[PDB]
Amino acid sequence: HMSLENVAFNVVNKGHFDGQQGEVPVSIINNTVYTKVDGVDVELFENKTTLPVNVAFELWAKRNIKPVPEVKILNNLGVDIAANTVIWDYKRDAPAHISTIGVCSMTDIAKKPTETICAPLTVFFDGRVDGQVDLFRNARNGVLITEGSVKGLQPSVGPKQASLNGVTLIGEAVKTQFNYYKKVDGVVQQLPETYFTQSRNLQEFKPRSQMEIDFLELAMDEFIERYKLEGYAFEHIVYGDFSHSQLGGLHLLIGLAKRFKESPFELQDFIPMDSTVKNYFITDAQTGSSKCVCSVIDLLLDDFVEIIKSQDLSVVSKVVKVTIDYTEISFMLWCKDGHVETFYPKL
Amino acid sequence: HMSLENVAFNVVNKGHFDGQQGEVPVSIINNTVYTKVDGVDVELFENKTTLPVNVAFELWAKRNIKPVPEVKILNNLGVDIAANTVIWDYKRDAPAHISTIGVCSMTDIAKKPTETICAPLTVFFDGRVDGQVDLFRNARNGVLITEGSVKGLQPSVGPKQASLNGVTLIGEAVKTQFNYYKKVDGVVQQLPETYFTQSRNLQEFKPRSQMEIDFLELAMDEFIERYKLEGYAFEHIVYGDFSHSQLGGLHLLIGLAKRFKESPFELQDFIPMDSTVKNYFITDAQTGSSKCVCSVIDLLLDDFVEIIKSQDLSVVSKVVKVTIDYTEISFMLWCKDGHVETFYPKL
Amino acid sequence: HMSLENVAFNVVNKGHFDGQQGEVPVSIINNTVYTKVDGVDVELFENKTTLPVNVAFELWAKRNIKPVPEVKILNNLGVDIAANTVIWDYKRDAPAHISTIGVCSMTDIAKKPTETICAPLTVFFDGRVDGQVDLFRNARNGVLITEGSVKGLQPSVGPKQASLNGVTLIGEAVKTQFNYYKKVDGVVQQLPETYFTQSRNLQEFKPRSQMEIDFLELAMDEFIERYKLEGYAFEHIVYGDFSHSQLGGLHLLIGLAKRFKESPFELQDFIPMDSTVKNYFITDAQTGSSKCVCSVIDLLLDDFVEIIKSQDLSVVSKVVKVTIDYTEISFMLWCKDGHVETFYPKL
Amino acid sequence: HMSLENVAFNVVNKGHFDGQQGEVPVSIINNTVYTKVDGVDVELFENKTTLPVNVAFELWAKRNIKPVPEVKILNNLGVDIAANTVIWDYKRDAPAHISTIGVCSMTDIAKKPTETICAPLTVFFDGRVDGQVDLFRNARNGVLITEGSVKGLQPSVGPKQASLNGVTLIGEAVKTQFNYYKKVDGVVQQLPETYFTQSRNLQEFKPRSQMEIDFLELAMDEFIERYKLEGYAFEHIVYGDFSHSQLGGLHLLIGLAKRFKESPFELQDFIPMDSTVKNYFITDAQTGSSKCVCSVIDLLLDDFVEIIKSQDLSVVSKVVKVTIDYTEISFMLWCKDGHVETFYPKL
Amino acid sequence: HMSLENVAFNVVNKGHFDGQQGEVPVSIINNTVYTKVDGVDVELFENKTTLPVNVAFELWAKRNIKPVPEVKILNNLGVDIAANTVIWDYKRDAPAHISTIGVCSMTDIAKKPTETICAPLTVFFDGRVDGQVDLFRNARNGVLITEGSVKGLQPSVGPKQASLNGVTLIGEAVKTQFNYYKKVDGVVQQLPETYFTQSRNLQEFKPRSQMEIDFLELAMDEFIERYKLEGYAFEHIVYGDFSHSQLGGLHLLIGLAKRFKESPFELQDFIPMDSTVKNYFITDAQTGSSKCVCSVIDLLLDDFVEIIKSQDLSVVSKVVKVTIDYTEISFMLWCKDGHVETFYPKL
């Protein structure tokens, strides 16, 4: 009993697809799903995806309503498809993966992940569901997450935050902390040591360390002198330069939150997706300084201090590679006469 | 168990909605219903109505597949809604009635015709299905059709033709003649004597009397001397005039079939509906004569002769009323010095 | 003189349809109405309804611009259609009624309300317009509102608030208090005693009594000792749990406005319509507690105290029926020993 | 240099994509591709597929313009994808396969068929292109066609007809006979003996044997006594019944061509796809007989004689399986007292 | 090398069209441009204009990213078209001019502005670009801006603000101040002395003079006794009435900012375009007072004092004409005895 009228029945009552039988009338007109309640037409879902309106409406109702990792983590890892679930990308208002495994007949490429066609793809397994760990041991390419320890496998601790119904949080009523495992062509691989982005928003910005709390409250000269950050060009990289028509650096999200309270500005996210590094079109409303492409990243200020602390100051320029979110990020370093000029993520 | 996937299942197998259980996948995209046979998408229904695509697709599958009266007949009687069926207008690619009675929940204004809301509306009953003759006796306003006799009621013989799956024919494997009955505000009415339009096409024209067979084969002069049709202006009304820029006459359809096979021409309907009187935009192509609005009717040539040979030729102008297809049609008659100039349907 | 160019002329000049003669050019393209001002195209209306773009544009221009009752009041009463006006539901962005009476030819089912087809429907009359009271006395089925007294009829005091151009307010420059009358099948009926929802928003929440002002400011323990609310489970019903992954109660809007400046959260109004009881998908940040369906209501805290302090605490649990907004709402109490456990609106 | 303006340039000049380099302006508006020639807008492509309008326009321009096998042949063999070409389905106005191999970046799943992802899929290879035969030897699952002999493999002769630009013909300026080869999981298979459907239209029917020519010219009784078909029920199954409301047989298409020229009728082709067996909704316009689902097949009359003259007439009911177009078709046989009643394709 | 794939490549990399070679795949579906990044579809542009989706996407990518005058300034002047650039109207989400000169082949009416067809139109020239100035000396109708002095021409100082990427600002990193010139049929014309609209928003309002700062902070009686504003009706024109169901005056944007802080209200911009005078549908909360059309303007409070102080208060009915933003605005002044009643911009 998989029908459009039954899916809309679960949306009306339970809020999501709960497997409850029952039917309600439905009207389809221009990427919008309507229903009739007490004689009036009520909107239920507006298709913003590249799929038909009835297919996307069914995938949205069968979304995962539990804490799941963020899309950028699943994309930095070679994940291609999900197993017996739907991971909804709330930033794109669309699914994160276009094919399914035993969820929607229109998008199903297979009923079970062990089928022959699922071999070259990297399947995502959720250890919190029964029998998923056994299938991961029998899969060729895959990624597994668990809340605890799995016997015989070396775990890699994940980030402290996770997405719940589109809300990134560090849960205390739930876990949001996962152990990560990965197999490639049957061989379990060692995930390297890495940093993690904090995934914070400009508005409702909150510090997470004593060094951060000092950065928001203290002045520019006061913060540099106390934390011995001289000759490291924190004025240009973090604070940013608004003196000329072109904006200088300003490549830390912590540098945006401090400027936002004292002087608002305009951001253009011309590539609206979830990535470790983001590029924005910035135009300072107070001075007039601007820059077409501005690569910004959200690292903990302590971690950025630790990274810049361990680099050579002799060479004029050199490529620096740092593993963040299970992937290598390339930085460009400029040095002149014992001090660094700029240090930004490479384009 | 009403659902979109179940309706498409009956369309794939039985061709129409037969009440068989089973589901098949469906894709909705831009007023078009698709299904997945094997592994390819197949078109099934193209919405050309003013209704949502999923609603019109269900009404089309639940159409009546038995000989039913034509739309122009039901419109002339003032029928407002059908009872427990759907009469599909094949000329408009849309239903003939928008509201339903116990057919589709989205369009159902009632579940039984005896409910209070259906009192002022003219309900159409089909006596060929059980129990309809009792509801007609208990209905305030309704129309009844049968194949035989009904006790205690005076019948009125209908036309010899009917529409079966969009094809108008005079059936011999089935019966297409119906006895008509009508009630208004509780009172049974006496239906008057009337003429019937033959409802024939242009390219596939067929005569239905010896006078018609003689009209097609014989020339203009020899058909007027025989049958004695002088002074009634059959050269203008039926044959038509192509000498000047404006076309003259041509109002009997049988004059179109004769001219069509000897020299084609163009026709624009610009009002595509089923009416007793049709207006066309005609261009002669051969000579260049044309007319914006040309009122055309399809009567048996014997009946048109009987109508014209029953008027007073003394007056100069007079409005004439004729009952055709259970409705009064108005004609304009011009007479000069004891003979007729023109005699066309009023606009 | 009803036309599209004329209606757009009134929209450009007067703002709404004022009946002023004049025309302006119009361009229609994908549910959007454009006009040319100084040589550039300007958007005027975006069709969000299930109606054609030109029909919905005319109904929106002819909307009622005076204080009118809220849609939930008109729906709790058996109101079906409006008489010589258009009540615009500012939620859903669509009219509240789909048929009209002498307003728009496309939607008009009649010109005057006393026509035969309007008898079984419950018509809404506005006593502030001339002659409406007389029609209500001859309406058989209808609902009437007045600012003063009608001789020979027993009035029922309505709520203090009303909607003006979509804004719910308690007007002092105008009068938003109305006397309510209702007739069924010719018989005037007695409207029962009822409570009224306050119709407030989360943001810009404002108390309306001393007990409410004490709720926002005082702590949880101090507000229960005072006002004497022990054993009545205001901790679970109003305050909320937030401790065990699934949210406890939180069934009062006053309970959501306190959680505001303390811990923001997310709300999903998966059925966007105006109802006396609303169901939200809540997911609280910071902790991670959530719940699929949460029935919330916005009563005055004094009224909820008056309701809960008049029940029997002996039974294990029964069903309680209370009248709010001229309709009965079912509550699900729960008791154990000499105290109550939960008391929530029934699904 | 792949671009929309370059593709449209080849469509304007060469007719199809020839890779000639050059650009012309293009306009996209509602599933239609326009171009500007001398200042006026000209339509070039109307999207009727389930793909974006710009993607389908590129696949249509890169279609194969050489004699290729029909889609029903490729479907019966289970072909899943084509190699370095695009097979256009002219009946569906859409490609026969959705994914591509080194043709269009939006649809390309691989650059060469030898990649790992293409292993489980049945790839189609055209031996008329250079290095395609070598890839078929190294392919796990594939289908090979050629005009001559390949050494080391046993060939299977195909049908005499093929599709050229949507026209099915038996060419003499080109060769439409192909040798068929197939591999599954590495092992080459032996294709069984089979019959072939002639793929003929109704309005342009042409006989292909002396028995067919005698069938069209001679009468019913005269064609039965000669060739001797006394108790095999060719007086229906091929001719048809037409006596009652339900139609008898008509299952040979050649029986439709004989009836069509003597009396037209209506045919509804729901599920419009290219299949070995087609189901039509037929309504005889002369008598009124009809049938919802009528299974029709197009075999040479000699072949159908060879099949029916090779069964056991003793049993009452028996399921018969015949290999036609490289697939097994099921038939229902009814016999009574030494003769055959009906013999139709199983639904 | 003009192509859709190359334009999208510059948008992904540089943010705007920079003339960089390279292509990326693109999908078009329902007024939205998509691209494939790491295997997922990402939205890049949503067509809100009256142009095809592919043409508007190219015009938006080629917009001017430098400080340019506002739309109302160019519209108050006779500007019809721009030369070798695209001025994007951010309030309408559409270009300010619909034809181009050497920018987009679909919209190019000419390559260079000196062509014959560009003579009767008023072309916009940017003196900051090489050339341009010399073309203005050889143009028949045009408008020229510059940062410095042009020898032999009398300049006119423009406003102190301009738009940069849709942000109106008084730049100190950039100049944002321009000299204005204009020619009509070959004759240079003298621009009159004018006032300038401040172009400020409501929610983030900021004073710009000592008199304004005193207006926000001080009370109504305190601000009128000082600055001698008795008998000039500043209580009705600027402050507002809010007493009698219909709002009185309130025609200064400075009057809205004061009321918005102390009591929010609703505004309908039923004509969303950039004009010197705006008309809003205002409904004040808490009171219920409203007005269909309320003409508002944003002048410096010192300026409005300077205008009202230099008028004759003895007469009624006269019509006052003031030059603001290079165009004359008509005011209606009402007087009674030795004081003025109202003074608003005329409808």
Side-chain angles (χ1 to χ4, degrees), chain E residues 52-72:
Chain E
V53 59
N54 62 316
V55 179
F57 174 62
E58 182 174 348
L59 296 182
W60 175 75
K62 299 179 180 179
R63 65 189 179 277
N64 195 284
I65 59 180
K66 296 195 305 176
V68 293
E70 291 181 320
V71 160
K72 59 183 180 183

Side-chain angles (χ1 to χ4, degrees), chain E residues 218-230:
Chain E
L218 280 67
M220 187 176 65
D221 296 330
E222 199 80 27
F223 189 83
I224 293 181
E225 288 294 313
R226 199 198 301 181
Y227 300 113
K228 39 103 227 172
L229 295 184
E230 289 91 359

Side-chain angles (χ1 to χ4, degrees), chain B residues 101-113:
Chain B
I101 298 178
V103 172
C104 176
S105 61
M106 281 295 308
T107 61
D108 276 335
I109 71 175
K111 23 184 191 307
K112 288 151 288 298

Side-chain angles (χ1 to χ4, degrees), chain B residues 81-84 100-105 107-123 125 135-136 138-141, chain C residues 117 119-121:
Chain B
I81 198 173
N84 304 332
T100 59
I101 298 178
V103 172
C104 176
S105 61
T107 61
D108 276 335
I109 71 175
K111 23 184 191 307
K112 288 151 288 298
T114 186
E115 285 186 302
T116 317
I117 191 60
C118 308
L121 289 80
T122 308
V123 177
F125 303 98
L135 307 179
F136 180 77
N138 307 10
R140 187 176 185 177
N141 320 275
Chain C
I117 195 178
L121 300 182

Side-chain angles (χ1 to χ4, degrees), chain E residues 37-329:
Chain E
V37 171
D38 299 355
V40 305
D41 302 322
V42 178
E43 170 182 325
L44 286 178
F45 176 81
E46 186 183 25
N47 184 25
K48 301 283 194 60
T49 78
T50 62
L51 302 172
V53 59
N54 62 316
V55 179
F57 174 62
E58 182 174 348
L59 296 182
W60 175 75
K62 299 179 180 179
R63 65 189 179 277
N64 195 284
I65 59 180
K66 296 195 305 176
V68 293
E70 291 181 320
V71 160
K72 59 183 180 183
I73 294 297
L74 303 181
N75 287 350
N76 289 4
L77 304 181
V79 182
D80 284 84
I81 202 167
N84 304 336
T85 187
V86 171
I87 302 300
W88 187 264
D89 189 355
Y90 285 86
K91 299 185 183 303
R92 285 171 52 254
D93 292 355
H97 311 102
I98 210 170
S99 289
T100 61
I101 290 113
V103 172
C104 179
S105 63
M106 281 299 309
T107 60
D108 275 336
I109 66 179
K111 289 294 299 180
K112 287 301 122 186
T114 57
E115 297 193 29
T116 60
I117 205 175
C118 307
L121 296 182
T122 310
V123 191
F124 177 76
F125 300 86
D126 189 0
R128 297 174 294 186
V129 182
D130 300 1
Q132 305 292 303
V133 186
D134 301 60
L135 288 313
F136 179 78
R137 295 182 179 268
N138 310 339
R140 196 172 185 87
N141 317 283
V143 172
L144 175 63
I145 63 175
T146 183
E147 289 177 317
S149 62
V150 191
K151 54 178 180 60
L153 299 181
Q154 306 305 309
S156 181
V157 175
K160 300 169 298 181
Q161 71 277 20
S163 178
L164 176 58
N165 297 127
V167 190
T168 300
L169 49 84
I170 302 179
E172 60 196 48
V174 292
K175 187 137 187 176
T176 216
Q177 182 119 232
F178 315 99
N179 299 336
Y180 282 90
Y181 320 99
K182 185 181 180 181
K183 293 178 60 182
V184 180
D185 285 351
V187 173
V188 181
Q189 292 208 322
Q190 176 120 284
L191 296 182
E193 330 301 327
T194 174
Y195 291 86
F196 289 141
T197 313
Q198 295 304 310
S199 304
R200 293 176 291 187
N201 276 125
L202 183 58
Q203 292 185 311
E204 309 189 31
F205 188 82
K206 290 184 176 60
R208 294 179 180 180
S209 69
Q210 184 64 49
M211 177 182 294
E212 286 189 343
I213 299 179
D214 294 336
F215 178 88
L216 281 75
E217 178 67 19
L218 280 67
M220 187 176 65
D221 296 330
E222 199 80 27
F223 189 83
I224 293 181
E225 288 294 313
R226 199 198 301 181
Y227 300 113
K228 39 103 227 172
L229 295 184
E230 289 91 359
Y232 291 108
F234 275 70
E235 312 86 316
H236 176 272
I237 295 177
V238 189
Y239 285 101
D241 194 6
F242 306 94
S243 67
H244 284 175
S245 303
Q246 151 152 102
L247 201 146
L250 200 58
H251 302 144
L252 258 291
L253 184 53
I254 230 298
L256 304 183
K258 178 102 193 311
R259 179 54 181 256
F260 177 79
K261 177 188 182 302
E262 298 171 333
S263 181
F265 44 90
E266 287 284 341
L267 287 181
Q268 296 189 31
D269 193 3
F270 60 110
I271 302 146
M273 70 183 308
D274 189 49
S275 301
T276 309
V277 175
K278 291 295 298 181
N279 297 319
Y280 293 97
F281 197 111
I282 164 180
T283 303
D284 173 54
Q286 203 54 251
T287 59
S289 190
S290 62
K291 169 174 286 186
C292 297
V293 276
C294 192
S295 53
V296 195
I297 196 178
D298 180 49
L299 274 179
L300 213 168
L301 188 54
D302 294 319
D303 294 358
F304 183 78
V305 167
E306 177 174 320
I307 274 90
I308 191 180
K309 135 258 184 300
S310 175
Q311 296 295 338
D312 193 359
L313 79 179
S314 307
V315 210
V316 202
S317 318
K318 46 228 157 301
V319 170
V320 188
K321 310 165 67 180
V322 185
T323 298
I324 299 177
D325 298 355
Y326 294 139
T327 183
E328 299 182 6
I329 275 74

Side-chain angles (χ1 to χ4, degrees), chain C residues 67-255:
Chain C
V68 288
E70 291 181 314
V71 179
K72 60 182 181 182
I73 297 296
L74 304 180
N75 288 341
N76 295 342
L77 308 180
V79 181
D80 286 77
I81 199 176
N84 306 331
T85 185
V86 169
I87 303 302
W88 186 263
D89 188 359
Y90 282 84
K91 306 176 186 60
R92 300 169 50 251
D93 291 352
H97 312 97
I98 205 171
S99 288
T100 58
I101 299 178
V103 171
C104 179
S105 61
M106 283 299 307
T107 60
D108 276 336
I109 69 177
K111 289 293 298 181
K112 98 204 281 198
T114 70
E115 295 190 15
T116 319
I117 195 178
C118 305
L121 300 182
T122 308
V123 194
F124 176 78
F125 304 98
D126 188 4
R128 296 170 297 184
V129 182
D130 305 355
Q132 302 288 125
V133 178
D134 296 61
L135 303 184
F136 179 77
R137 297 182 180 268
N138 320 324
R140 187 179 186 90
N141 304 284
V143 170
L144 176 60
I145 59 172
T146 53
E147 286 179 314
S149 356
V150 187
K151 54 181 185 62
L153 296 179
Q154 304 305 105
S156 181
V157 176
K160 298 181 179 180
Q161 68 278 23
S163 178
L164 173 61
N165 298 125
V167 184
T168 302
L169 49 82
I170 302 181
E172 58 197 49
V174 296
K175 193 173 184 179
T176 64
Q177 191 112 228
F178 311 103
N179 301 333
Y180 282 88
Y181 321 96
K182 183 183 180 181
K183 296 176 54 183
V184 322
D185 289 355
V187 175
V188 183
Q189 288 205 323
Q190 176 115 289
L191 300 183
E193 329 296 75
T194 175
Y195 291 84
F196 290 139
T197 349
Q198 295 303 310
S199 303
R200 295 190 293 259
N201 281 10
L202 186 73
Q203 300 166 322
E204 284 83 17
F205 187 88
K206 297 176 177 298
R208 295 179 181 180
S209 70
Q210 184 62 49
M211 179 183 295
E212 285 191 344
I213 301 180
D214 292 355
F215 176 85
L216 279 75
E217 179 67 20
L218 279 70
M220 167 177 161
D221 293 330
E222 294 194 0
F223 189 81
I224 296 180
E225 291 298 321
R226 189 173 293 163
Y227 298 101
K228 295 83 196 173
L229 301 182
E230 70 287 347
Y232 290 107
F234 275 63
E235 325 151 18
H236 181 278
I237 292 180
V238 190
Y239 284 102
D241 194 4
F242 302 93
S243 65
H244 290 111
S245 299
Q246 188 183 36
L247 207 152
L250 201 66
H251 301 149
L252 254 291
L253 224 195
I254 233 303

